[PDB]
Design a protein around this ligand. Structure first.
Ligand SMILES: Cc1ncc(C[n+]2csc(CCOP(=O)(O)OP(=O)(O)O)c2C)c(N)n1
Ligand SMILES: Cc1ncc(C[n+]2csc(CCOP(=O)(O)OP(=O)(O)O)c2C)c(N)n1
Ligand SMILES: Cc1ncc(C[n+]2csc(CCOP(=O)(O)OP(=O)(O)O)c2C)c(N)n1
Ligand SMILES: [Ca+2]
Ligand SMILES: [Ca+2]
Ligand SMILES: [Ca+2]
Ligand SMILES: [Ca+2]
Ligand SMILES: [Mg+2]
Lengths: 524, 524, 524
C-alpha cells in the first residue's frame, strides 16, 4: 500500500472523517483520490481554516484534522494556533512540503526549518526523515494532540512521500488506543475528600477544561453536595457551569487583587480545569488572603508548575470531577445567597446598548443556543445577562486573539446542527477573519452572526482611558458596511438600528434556513 | 527621558516616521503621546498590516516599522513574513508583551517564548532583559533589518518598559551609520572583469535584489557593454530590467532542466542579485550543460552557500553592478535583437482571456505604472505583455504566499503617490487579505485592484492536471461578489464582462479620485 | 527579603539541601552567604557535575539541584543532559547569566538566547523577565522536573537579580505540593485487569521507570500472580526486577525482529515503565507476530505517542503497578522455572575474560551492591552474571552517551552510603569524565571503580565487523595508565592482571575506607 492509502486508513480507523483545508500544490498528492467517506471543508484563508476546525473540535470534543499549504499557509494560521494552544484544542495540523529532491536548493514553496515554524504554539512539531515514516508520524500527531493536556500539533510532509510504499508493518498503527483518562490514587484521593468534607466555607473555581471534558454535570453535583459558591475562572474560553444555577457566582475579573478579594473567607478553594489564574489587567495584590488554602486540579503540567500558590493535582478532568462528585458528603450548609438580577438599562429609540442586545437575545434565543463572544468591551455584561443552562454553550478566544469567533461559530454549528449558534462579534473583530463567511454560505451552515457596530475598537478606548493615555492613533474603524461584506460572500444580511428592528431581525434570523448576519448599531 | 521618548527619537533620527499597525493593549503605552511628526497606518488584520509595510519598504528602498499585538497579532502576520524573508524586505516588527510582573504566571496576552515565535522567518528575534535596554535593542533591530542581506526582524517589548527611565548614554544610538555598501577587492574584481571581457557568448541573469538596490540602469549598461542577452531569474519577486530593452529575454522558467537548456552555448553566465535558482516545478536534469560556467553575485551568504553550481561572490548588489558596469570593455559583437512582440489572441465577445487583459493594460496604463501580480495562472503571460520601462514596476509574492499583492499594492501606492499602482489579483488570492481594502479607502490611497474572476483556483487545477490527480476537492471558489466586498470596505467598484466593458472600466478607474476595484470575468 | 534569601527558603522548603556545581563569576552572587543547612558538591568539569547529580537524583528518587556557569558551563554538560532526558532524571539545572545592564552589548559571559541552548534536551527552559520573578521561575523549574514524566529543566538567572527585593507574595510558593500520582479510572482499569486475567500466555516487559518509581516489588507480585515471564526492555538504563527470580528472562536484545520472535506465542504482552521500544541495532522485521497483543503503561506521553504498536495508558508507574498487582487473579498456570545459571567461561593464568570478572564480582560483592555499567562490549554478559535482588541496583547511560557511569557512581554512592557502589567501566569510556574521580577523593565518597582495559573501543570494533567495514580509523586507545590517573586525582589505585590479582584487589577495595580504582587487564 502507498503512504497515501495507509494514511487515510489510519485517519479513518482513528475516527477522523473530515479535512479542513485551504489547498496548495504541495498538498495535491495528498488530496488526490479523496476517499468517499471523507468530506473536505474549504475556507478562503488559513486563520479561517484553523478557526473553523477549532470550533468543530471544541464542540465535538474530538480531534480535528487540518491541511494547509507549506510555510505561508501555516504562517497565516499562527494567530489561530495561539488561541488553540490556550483552549487545549486537539488540532492536527498538516502542511505540504516540497518534494525531497528540491528541499536542498530551497525551491519556491520549500518550508525551511519547518518544525520550528509553529513553535512555540504546538505540543509537537515534526517532519519525517523518510516517506515510509509518514504513517507513523501521523499516528504520533494524532495521539500527541489527543492526550491530556490536549493541544495543536504540526506535521510537515514532502509531497513526493504520498505515492511511496508504506511500511507493511504500519497496519499496527491502525487500532492503537491511547488513554490518559486517569485520576489521583485512592490514598491521596481520600485525603482530598476529607479536606473537602472538613471545610467550613469551601469555594469552587471552574475552567474551560471542565466543559471540554463534559464534566459540567459532575461539577454541579459537587457544588450542590458542598453547598459551595461557584466561579468561572478569569478570561473564560468556555462556560463550565449553568449560569443561573443557585451556586453560580459569575465570571471572575481577571485581576490578582480582585480575585483574592472574591475568595476571602473561604478556607478551601478547589479549582478544576483552569490555569491558576489567567489574569489580564494589572491589579497588584495578594494571590490569596491568609486563611485561604487552594487546591488545583488540572490536566496540564504547565499549569500546575506555574500556579504561584496552592497545591496541584495533574489528572484527567472528567475522571477527577466524577470521582469527587460521588465521594464527597452531602453538606447541610445553606446554599449561597441569591445573586442580584442584572438591571434593565434605559433604552431610547436610537442606537442599542449592549445590555439591551443581551437582554433581547436571552429572551428570544432557544434554551440550548450556543453563543460565541468576540465583542471585547461587553464580555462582563454578556456573562451577566445570558442564561446558559447546558454544556458547550459559550466560546471566547482563549488567547484573546481576534479572528476566532467568526470562523469558530461555523465549526461549532457544523458540529452541533441541532443547536442554534449565535456569534456576537464587534465590528472591529469581524474583520480579522471576515472571509470565513463564505464557508457558511457554501456549505449552508446556518450560523447567526450578530455584529455589534459602534465604529471603534471599544475595549482599546477603555484601556486607553484608565491608562490616561492621550493621542493614541488607530482606535477608530468607521466606514465598514457589514451587510455588503455579507452579500459579497453570499450570506443573507439584516440591519438593526433600534430595539424594534433588533426584535424583528432576530425573529427573522431564527426562522431562516441558512446563515444570517445582523449588523447592530450599538452605542459608542 | 523615558524609554518611550528616547525610542521615538531614535526612530526619527534613523529615518523612520511611519508606523504600520493593528493596536492592542500591550501596545498602548507605546502608542500614547504619538509624535505629531509620525504617521500611523491602521490595517484591520495583521497579514494586511505587514503586507502594506512590505510594499512600502520594497518601493521606498528603506526599512518599514510595524507594531503588532503580542503573540496573536504576530501569529496572524507570519504568512506575510514568509514572503518578506524571501524578498529581503527590511521590516522592523515590534510586538507588545505583558508587563514584566505578569509574564511569570502567563497572564492573558503574554507572548510565551516570544523570540521563538517568528523563527525561522526573521534575521534576528529578541526580547530585552530590562527596560533601559529597549532603545539599544531597537537600534539593533533597525540595523539588522537594514544591513545586507536585508530582511525582517522581531522585537518584543513588555508594555511597562515604555514609561521607565532610559539610559542617558542611549544618545549614542541616534546617529549611528552602518554600511554594507561593499564590493569585491580590486585584485579579484579585475580577474572577474577579465573573464567577462574574454567571454565569447556571455549571458546575464538578474534577480530582485537588483531592483531593490536600484541597480537596474547599471545592469542595462553592463548588458549593453557585453552585448549579452538578459534573463530574469525564476519565481521573480520584482522586475530588475526594462522589459522592452533589446537584450531582454524575459522570465526564466522555474525548472532545473529548462534553465540549463536556455543557458546551453553560453560560456559564461553572470547571475546578479538572485538565488541560484528559485526553482519551483519538478523538472529534473542538469544544473548546467558542460561548456557553461556560472558566476553569482549575491548579497546573501545563505544564497551563495546553497547554490548547487558555479562560483559566488557575496557583496552589495548596488556597489557590484556599478563597478562591473564601469570596468568591462565595450564588446564589438552585435547587440542582441529585441525579442518578438507577443501575439494577439483571438478575443470573442465572451469572457476575457488574460492575454487580452494584459494587452489592454499595456495599451492604457501610464508608462510609469507599477504592477502587482497575484493572478497565479497568468504570470508568464503578464511578463510577456507588460512594457515595464522603469525600476520598481513589478511585485510578486516572494515565497509564493497569497495575500501579499492586495495590501502590498496599498503600501506601494503610499510610497509612490505619483505612480499609478495596478494590482492584478485572482478571485482566489483576493480573499486572503480582503480587509486591506479598508486602509486604501480610509487613507485615500488610490490603488487600482483588477480582480481576475474565473471562479476557481486556476493554478491548482493546472498542477492537478499535470500530476494527473483526480478527485481533488477544494479547487473551486464560486459565489463571491467582489463589488459587494469593495462596497463593504468603502471602495468604488466596477464590473467588466467583456473587452469593451474592460476598456470603459479601466478608463474610469484611471481618472477616478480614490481606490477602485474592477471585477473582471475571465476564462478558465 | 532578597531574591537570594527567598530562593534558598524555597529550595529548603521543597526538600533540596544539596547543590552540585562548578562555579563562575555569574554565580558568585547566588553562591555567597551559602546556607549552613546546605552542602555544595564541587566537580572539575560540568559533564561530571551533572553526571554526579544525575546518579544522586536517580538513586534518591528525588530532584537534584545543579548550578553551572553561563553558556560554556551549560554546554560542557549537554552530553550529560541527553542521558538525563532519556532516564527521566529530575534535574534542576540553573546557570548564571550576565548582569542585565550588560546583556545588550553581549559582554563576555553573556548567555545569548539562553533558553534555546539546552533545547531539545530539557522539559522546560527559561530566563525570567525581572529579578522579582526569579523565585516563581525557580518554583516552576522544581515542579516541571518533578512531575511525571520526570526530566531535566533549565533556568538562566542574571547575576544582579539575587540582591534585589523579592515579591512578598512569593511565600505562597514555599509549601506548594504538586502530585502526578494518578492511575487509570476504575472502569477502564477493571477492563485491563480482565484482559490480563483472560490471557492464556501473558508476558511482562519492564522499563527503567519501574525502578525509578520503586515499583519493583509490585511488579514481582504481578508476575507471580499472572505466572508470567519477565523481560527488561532493551537498552536498559536501570534494573526493574530481581535478576534471579524464577520469572526473570533477562535483557531483551535491542532489535525489532529479535523482540517479536521473543514474544511470539504470547497472546498478551504488558509493558510497564518503558519506551516501546528502545531498539538500537538494525534488525528489521515485524514489530509483533500475529496472535500477540501489546498493552503499554507509560508515564510519558511522548512514549505513548511514538509506540508503533499496542494500546497505551499514560499514568504514574508506582500507582499503576500497585493497582494492577493487587487486582489481578492468582492464575492456575504453573510458575515459570528459573533461567539456568550461566556457564563458567574457561580462564587461564593470563588476561581476564569479562565473564570471569562478572562471576567474581557476583561471588564477592555484598548482596545489596549497586552496579554501574559503562563497559559497552560486555553488557549482555553483565546482565546474565550479576544477581541483583534489590531495587536501584543498576545504572547504564540511558542515551548511550559515555561519561555517565564514572561521575554517576559517585552520586549514587553519596545517595546510598550503606550500599557499596561498584562502577564497571571500559578503558574507552573512563576518559570522558575522568576528572570526576577528584570529587570522590575530596568528599571521601567510597565508590569502587573497576576499569576494563582491553586497549580498544571494543564495541566499535565489533560493529565494524558486522558492517564488514574496513580501514576504520580511531578505534584503538593504547597507552593509558589508569593507576596514574587515579593517583593524579588522589584516588587509591590497584591493578589486576590475572584472576588471583583480581580477587586480591577486589577484597582490598571492598573493605577500603575511601574510593578505589582497579585497573583490570581484560582480553582483546
Ligand atoms: C489579532 C489581534 N489584534 C489585535 C488585538 C487587540 N484588541 C483587543 S480588543 C480589540 C478591539 C476589538 O474591537 P471590537 O471587535 O469592535 O469590539 P469592542 O471592543 O468595540 O466591543 C483589539 C483590536 C487582538 N486581541 N487580537
Ligand atoms: C496562503 C496561501 N494559501 C494557499 C496557497 C496555494 N495556492 C497557490 S495558487 C492558488 C490559486 C490562486 O487562485 P487565484 O487567485 O484565483 O489565481 P488563478 O490560479 O486562478 O490564476 C492557491 C490556493 C498559497 N500559495 N498561499
Ligand atoms: C560521548 C560518546 N562518544 C562516543 C560514543 C560511541 N561509543 C560507543 S561504545 C564506544 C566504545 C567504548 O569503549 P570501552 O569503554 O573501552 O568499552 P568496550 O566497548 O571496549 O567494552 C564508543 C566510543 C558514545 N556512545 N558516546
Ligand atoms: Ca466596536
Ligand atoms: Ca481564479
Ligand atoms: Ca575497551
Ligand atoms: Ca565498602
Ligand atoms: Mg516559530
Amino acid at each position: 500500500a502507498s503512504v497515501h492509502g495507509t494514511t487515510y486508513e489510519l485517519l479513518r480507523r482513528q475516527g477522523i472523517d473530515t479535512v479542513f483545508g485551504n489547498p496548495g500544490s504541495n498538498e495535491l498528492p495528498f488530496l488526490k483520490d479523496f476517499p468517499e467517506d471523507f468530506r473536505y471543508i474549504l475556507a478562503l484563508q488559513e486563520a479561517c481554516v484553523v478557526g473553523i476546525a477549532d470550533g468543530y473540535a471544541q464542540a465535538s470534543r474530538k480531534p480535528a484534522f487540518i491541511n494547509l499549504h507549506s510555510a505561508a499557509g501555516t504562517g497565516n494560521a499562527m494567530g489561530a494556533l495561539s488561541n488553540a494552544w490556550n483552549s487545549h484544542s486537539p488540532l492536527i495540523v498538516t502542511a505540504g512540503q516540497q518534494t525531497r529532491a528540491m528541499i536542498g536548493v530551497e525551491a519556491l514553496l520549500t518550508n525551511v526549518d519547518a518544525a520550528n515554524l509553529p513553535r512555540p504554539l504546538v505540543k509537537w512539531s515534526y517532519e519525517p526523515a523518510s516517506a515510509a515514516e509518514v504513517p507513523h508520524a501521523m499516528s504520533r500527531a494524532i495521539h500527541m494532540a489527543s492526550m491530556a493536556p490536549q493541544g495543536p500539533v504540526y506535521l510537515s510532509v514532502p509531497y513526493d512521500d504520498w505515492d511511496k510504499d508504506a511500511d507493511p508493518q504500519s497496519h499496527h498503527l491502525f487500532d492503537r488506543h491511547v488513554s490518559s483518562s486517569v485520576r489521583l490514587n485512592d490514598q491521596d484521593l481520600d485525603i482530598l475528600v476529607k479536606a473537602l468534607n472538613s471545610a467550613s466555607n469551601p469555594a469552587i473555581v471552574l475552567g474551560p477544561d471542565v466543559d471540554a471534558a463534559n464534566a459540567n454535570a459532575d461539577c454541579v453535583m459537587l457544588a450542590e453536595r458542598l453547598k459551595a459558591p461557584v466561579w468561572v475562572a478569569p478570561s473564560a474560553p468556555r462556560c463550565p457551569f449553568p449560569t443561573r444555577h443557585p451556586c453560580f457566582r459569575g465570571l471572575m475579573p481577571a485581576g490578582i487583587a480582585a480575585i483574592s478579594q472574591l475568595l476571602e473567607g473561604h478556607d478551601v478553594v478547589l479549582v478544576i480545569g483552569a490555569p491558576v489564574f489567567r489574569y489580564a489587567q494589572y491589579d497588584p495584590g495578594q494571590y490569596l488572603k491568609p486563611g485561604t488554602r487552594l487546591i488545583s486540579v488540572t490536566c496540564d503540567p504547565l499549569e500546575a508548575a506555574r500556579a504561584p500558590m496552592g497545591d496541584a493535582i495533574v489528572a484527567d478532568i472528567g475522571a477527577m470531577a466524577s470521582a469527587l462528585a460521588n465521594l464527597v458528603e452531602e453538606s447541610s450548609r445553606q446554599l449561597p445567597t441569591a445573586a442580584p438580577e442584572p438591571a434593565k438599562v434605559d433604552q431610547d429609540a436610537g442606537r442599542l446598548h449592549p445590555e439591551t442586545v443581551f437582554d433581547t437575545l436571552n429572551d428570544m434565543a432557544p434554551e440550548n443556543a450556543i453563543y460565541l463572544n468576540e465583542s471585547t468591551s461587553t464580555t462582563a455584561q454578556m456573562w451577566q445577562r445570558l442564561n446558559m443552562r447546558n454544556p458547550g454553550s459559550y466560546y471566547f478566544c482563549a488567547a484573546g486573539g481576534l479572528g476566532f469567533a467568526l470562523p469558530a461559530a461555523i465549526g461549532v454549528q457544523l458540529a452541533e446542527p441541532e443547536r442554534q449558534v449565535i456569534a456576537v462579534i464587534g465590528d472591529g473583530s469581524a474583520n480579522y477573519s471576515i472571509s470565513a463567511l463564505w464557508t457558511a454560505a457554501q456549505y449552508n451552515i446556518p450560523t447567526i452572526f450578530v455584529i455589534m457596530n459602534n465604529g471603534t475598537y471599544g475595549a482599546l478606548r477603555w484601556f486607553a482611558g484608565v491608562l490616561e493615555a492621550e493621542n493614541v492613533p488607530g482606535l477608530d474603524v468607521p466606514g465598514i458596511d457589514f451587510r455588503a461584506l455579507a452579500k459579497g460572500y453570499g450570506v443573507q444580511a439584516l440591519k438593526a438600528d433600534n430595539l424594534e428592528q433588533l426584535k424583528g431581525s432576530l425573529q427573522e434570523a431564527l426562522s431562516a434556513k441558512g446563515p444570517v448576519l445582523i449588523e447592530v448599531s450599538t452605542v459608542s
